[PDB]
Amino acid sequence: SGFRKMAFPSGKVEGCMVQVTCGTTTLNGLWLDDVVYCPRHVICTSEDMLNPNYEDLLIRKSNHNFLVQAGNVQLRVIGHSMQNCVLKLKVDTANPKTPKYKFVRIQPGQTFSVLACYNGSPSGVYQCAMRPNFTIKGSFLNGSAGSVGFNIDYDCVSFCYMHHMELPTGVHAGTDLEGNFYGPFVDRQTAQAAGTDTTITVNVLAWLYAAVINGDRWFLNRFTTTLNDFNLVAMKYNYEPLTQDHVDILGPLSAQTGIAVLDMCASLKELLQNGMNGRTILGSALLEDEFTPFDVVRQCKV
Amino acid sequence: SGFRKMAFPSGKVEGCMVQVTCGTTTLNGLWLDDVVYCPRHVICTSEDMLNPNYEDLLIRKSNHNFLVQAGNVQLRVIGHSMQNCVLKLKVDTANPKTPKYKFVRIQPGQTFSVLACYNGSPSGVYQCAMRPNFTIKGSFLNGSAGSVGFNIDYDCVSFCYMHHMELPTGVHAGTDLEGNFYGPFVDRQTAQAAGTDTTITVNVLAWLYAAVINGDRWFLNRFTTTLNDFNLVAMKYNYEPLTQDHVDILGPLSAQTGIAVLDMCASLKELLQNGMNGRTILGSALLEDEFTPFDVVRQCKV
């Protein structure tokens, strides 16, 4: 037993990280088959981040202006093309370590692992969620751009995030591997800011089921609620609405614990309105919302 | 910006995990060079749980009774030995993925990355601290014994933990890689209890520094303290003693923030005597003690 924020094993992604350098600017790239993906802001210099004309910057670059190193193996670039807000650098050598993979765009509320990398070298792996306001609360220093987020299912890597930038409140914004940003953000210096964030209700319910599975059940009670009475309280506490589809998705955990979803909602309602009164749930004094139902099922097994 | 529980990249350790089966019992082993290390209770049957005599159980086993599979490769056991609570199975092939490595016995309060594995297949990675009472709070189900904990420094994997068992309170116990158990525990299914745990003071101070680096400053104040006076307060709250060597190890974080270590001690003292008044620090409503000073510098150093 036990329940922990767990990331996926990072080995399959580690062998895909490379360093991309354009002039004096270096960040990380993702080397799959004979293509290296990286944020397009690598082609800027200090006099360019204000209003970059990315189309014109890239045309004026030649293939020999991109220095791609996979460890100490130099990869020769033989084509460069725009992919929305990332670059696809074609190289002459296929990555021998390319895993089975797909590119997937994740929904707010879904989790993934992040391999934080600097200078093409992995530093750490951690788990995090795509927030409802399309940011992630990551841990990233300067040079982390091009670090990727991913899920792994039966040795297939589903890449879902590439890191681009830090917003003024310290949260992080980035794209999918098709180069489209999550949320309204742009890869320019603007006054852009994260919108107000909310709590991921279905995940908090999943985590309370995990707590029940782990023998932590002081917050269960005899009350039940309707879905709508729950959602009115949830709104008041800046929680996302719970849909019928979320209730259905919580079906497997409801069956395993014998606790109906709307009874757990009654528990959550009481926790929102009265607090924990000094108690903890799974070691936490706050309600945790970065575990999905799938994360609980995979970690708690049967 | 941002602060997350961050594990080391797991690739180097993933290539060392194998499956060891004896009869109906399966768990994980660690394959380095031509030796597989695994918990000795793989040789246990139903009648052996309360007081196994492991000398007897091992003599009743031949090299052929041990099935080792690395991926889809059967490894031939050509030798078997018991050292303390682990078994060393000599196999006929050296692991080609053996990383540069060492075996180390970690000290209480130190942290490590755990690669949780079932059937020889890594499932997840997460951070754990060796508690002062020599347990860890992990996430381990049946079949996870032989999962390892490790740190990585300059491509060298320092193995510090092999998982063996779960105590009745739901916390975890295991050995170093020479098979010596952390704490007074024994690998048998008896009523065992850990001592009351204490809080790892140097790590709380490290995390307060992480909070300051990330913009939380509300708990700072002008009071300072002696090391001696603070340690009287720590003793009163079941906090570990702070040594002068802890103070030295916090110096890089005092340097980056401008807060003298004994001033941070004064802040911690006020936090313990008053609580947080519903405020949070780095997102938590509790003081967190599972980050070492090195852990904070790894994520925060400019």
Residue numbers in the entry:
A (entry chain A), B (entry chain B): 1 to 302
Text of the article:
The main protease of SARS-CoV-2 (Mpro, also referred to as 3-chymotrypsin-like protease or 3CLpro) is responsible for the majority of nsp processing, cleaving at 11 conserved sites along the polyprotein including self-excision of Mpro by autolytic cleavage of its own N-terminal and C-terminal autoprocessing sites. SARS-CoV-2 Mpro is a functional homodimer of two symmetrically disposed protomers that are each 306 residues in length (33.8 kDa). The active site of Mpro features a Cys145-His41 catalytic dyad, which orchestrates nucleophilic attack at the carbonyl carbon of the invariant P1 glutamine and the formation of an acyl enzyme intermediate central to efficient peptide cleavage. Using C-terminally substituted Mpro chimeras, we have determined X-ray crystallographic structures of Mpro in complex with 10 of its 11 viral cleavage sites, bound at full occupancy intermolecularly in trans, within the active site of either the native enzyme and/or a catalytic mutant (C145A).
Cleavage site C8 has crystallized with the same approximate unit cell dimensions and relative Mpro dimer orientation in the crystal lattice as that of the earlier structure for C5; however, the C8 crystallographic data is defined by the space group P212121 with four protomer molecules in the asymmetric unit (ASU) compared to space group C2 and two molecules for C5. C4, C6 (form 1 - see below for definition) and C12 also share a general relative disposition of Mpro dimers in the crystal packing but C4 and C6 have higher symmetry belonging to space group P22121 with three molecules in the ASU with the symmetry generated dimer contributing its C-terminus to one of the active sites of the non-crystallographic dimer. By far the most conserved residue at the P2 position though, in both viral and recently identified mammalian cleavage sites, is leucine, present in all of our collective of structures with the exception of C5 (phenylalanine) and C6 (valine). P2 valine, unique to cleavage site C6, also maintains a highly analogous set of interactions with a markedly similar S2 pocket, but with a less optimal vdW interaction surface as a result of the gap from the static pocket edge to the shorter beta-branched side chain of the P2(Val) C6 variant. Gln189 is more extended and forms a single hydrogen bond between side chain Oε1 and main chain NH of P2(Leu), an interaction common to all Leu/Val P2 substrates.
